[PDB]
Amino acid sequence: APSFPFSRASGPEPPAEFAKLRATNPVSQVKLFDGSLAWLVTKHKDVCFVATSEKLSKVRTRQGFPELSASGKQAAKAKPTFVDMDPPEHMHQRSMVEPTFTPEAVKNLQPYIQRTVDDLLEQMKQKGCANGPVDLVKEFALPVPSYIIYTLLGVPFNDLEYLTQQNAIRTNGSSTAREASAANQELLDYLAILVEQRLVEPKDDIISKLCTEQVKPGNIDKSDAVQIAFLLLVAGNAAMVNMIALGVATLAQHPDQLAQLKANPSLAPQFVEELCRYHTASALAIKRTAKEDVMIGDKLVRANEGIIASNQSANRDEEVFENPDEFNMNRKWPPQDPLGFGFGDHRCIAEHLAKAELTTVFSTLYQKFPDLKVAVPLGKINYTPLNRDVGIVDLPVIF
Ligand code: HEM
Numbered sequence: 087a088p089s090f091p092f093s094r095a096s097g098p099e100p101p102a103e104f105a106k107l108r109a110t111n112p113v114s115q116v117k118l119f120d121g122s123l124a125w126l127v128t129k130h131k132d133v134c135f136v137a138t139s140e141k142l143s144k145v146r147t148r149q150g151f152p153e154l155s156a157s158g159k160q161a162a163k164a165k166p167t168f169v170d171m172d173p174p175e176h177m178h179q180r181s182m183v184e185p186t187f188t189p190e191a192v193k194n195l196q197p198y199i200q201r202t203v204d205d206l207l208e209q210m211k212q213k214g215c216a217n218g219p220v221d222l223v224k225e226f227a228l229p230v231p232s233y234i235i236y237t238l239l240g241v242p243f244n245d246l247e248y249l250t251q252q253n254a255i256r257t258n259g260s261s262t263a264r265e266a267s268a269a270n271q272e273l274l275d276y277l278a279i280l281v282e283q284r285l286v287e288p289k290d291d292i293i294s295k296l297c298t299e300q301v302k303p304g305n306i307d308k309s310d311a312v313q314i315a316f317l318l319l320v321a322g323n324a325a326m327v328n329m330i331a332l333g334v335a336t337l338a339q340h341p342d343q344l345a346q347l348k349a350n351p352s353l354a355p356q357f358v359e360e361l362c363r364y365h366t367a368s369a370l371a372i373k374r375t376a377k378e379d380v381m382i383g384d385k386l387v388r389a390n391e392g393i394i395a396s397n398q399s400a401n402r403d404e405e406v407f408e409n410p411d412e413f414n415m416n417r418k419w420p421p422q423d424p425l426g427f428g429f430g431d432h433r434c435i436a437e438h439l440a441k442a443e444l445t446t447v448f449s450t451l452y453q454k455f456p457d458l459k460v461a462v463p464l465g466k467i468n469y470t471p472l473n474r475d476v477g478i479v480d481l482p483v484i485f
Pocket residue numbers: 137168169170180231235317318319321322323325326329367368369371372397425426427428429430431432433434435436437439440441
């Protein structure tokens with residue numbers, strides 16, 4: 087059984103194994119870092135099955151849970167938030183914070199999203215690039231999602247810059263373990279103060295709603311509110327930053343599509359759909375154990391065995407997506423959903439918000455900067471480590 091996670095074939099490419107497995111061994115066992123085994127599912131239909139089957143559990147205290155790193159086992163001991171709950175606990179908690187993320191609520195947030203993007207672009211323009219290229223990640227891909235989720239959560243404007251830097255430190259590959267941990271605990275400490283403040287004087291933010299609607303009635307306690315707020319901050323931010331950077335890189339790699347997008351910013355929704363299919367920035371979240379035996383394709387997954395369903399692989403499944411390794415923003419979409427945001431009950435709470443952030447970025451960035459260029463050869467872009475989720479660390483640009 088091969089060691090999993092697999093390493094990307096190269097900076098921007100999925101691991102090579104998936105294509106071979108889809109063709110020859112679509113449900114197979116892999117070996118995790120601790121020597122334990124897990125079933126790896128690679129076809130779109132089977133990923134959807136795993137995502138929705140009521141015979142499978144996200145509860146990490148079940149033995150056989152496929153923890154992928156030593157730190158993952160550590161984290162499994164803490165009180166779970168809804169990301170790791172099954173029904174009925176899952177929606178009991180997830181519903182406490184869904185209202186901000188509904189399609190309609192996101193539609194009404196569009197002018198706020200646009201303003202945030204515009205303001206960061208204007209700053210970038212005034213900082214300029216007269217002495218040399220600037221880092222698109224630091225100056226734009228990082229602050230856009232960070233500023234939005236922090237503001238939604240209830241952080242005041244003045245504190246965004248420092249807290250954006252510290253949340254980045256948490257996940258920067260360059261951070262030492264100490265630095266990352268300190269930044270983590272620091273964000274938690276910050277959030278705990280905000281919870282105290284909003285319990286005394288609520289404001290129009292997600293933390294206040296937790297406080298008034300859940301803490302004060304005794305449905306959850308203050309610590310729970312902190313953890314839920316924290317989940318919402320850290321679950322998707324690194325993914326968003328990576329999707330923005332990858333989109334810029336992908337457009338540079340496919341100049342005619344950049345040309346099309348500049349000529350018609352109304353193509354941004356379809357560009358984002360293709361981007362979220364092609365670059366599966368969160369590929370390791372659809373994990374389960376079997377509560378009882380379940381058949382998947384030609385395999386029996388027994389009770390207490392772990393399963394990993396690769397939405398990355400699903401998104402490249404030739405049976406669903408014609409010419410799947412072709413980036414094509416004019417793609418003719420099939421009836422089956424791309425799985426960038428997962429599937430089933432646990433499907434990304436923020437899918438609508440993420441897509442709105444990305445659409446706003448890709449309908450504005452090249453209007454503001456029609457001559458934006460990556461300022462290193464595309465071959466030399468600094469991607470995330472090949473054994474981690476796809477992403478970009480920094481991206482020098484000129485404009
Ligand atoms: C482009 C950016 C993003 C991508 C690609 C993405 C992708 C994902 C994927 C693959 C999952 C797993 C869903 C499943 O279990 O089937 C997920 C879950 C989740 N995401 Fe995102 N995400 C993104 C942005 C966000 C943002 C902006 C937030 C927060 C605001 C967020 C919050 C969450 C949470 C809380 C969950 C857990 C949902 C549950 O288990 O009920 N995500 N996301």
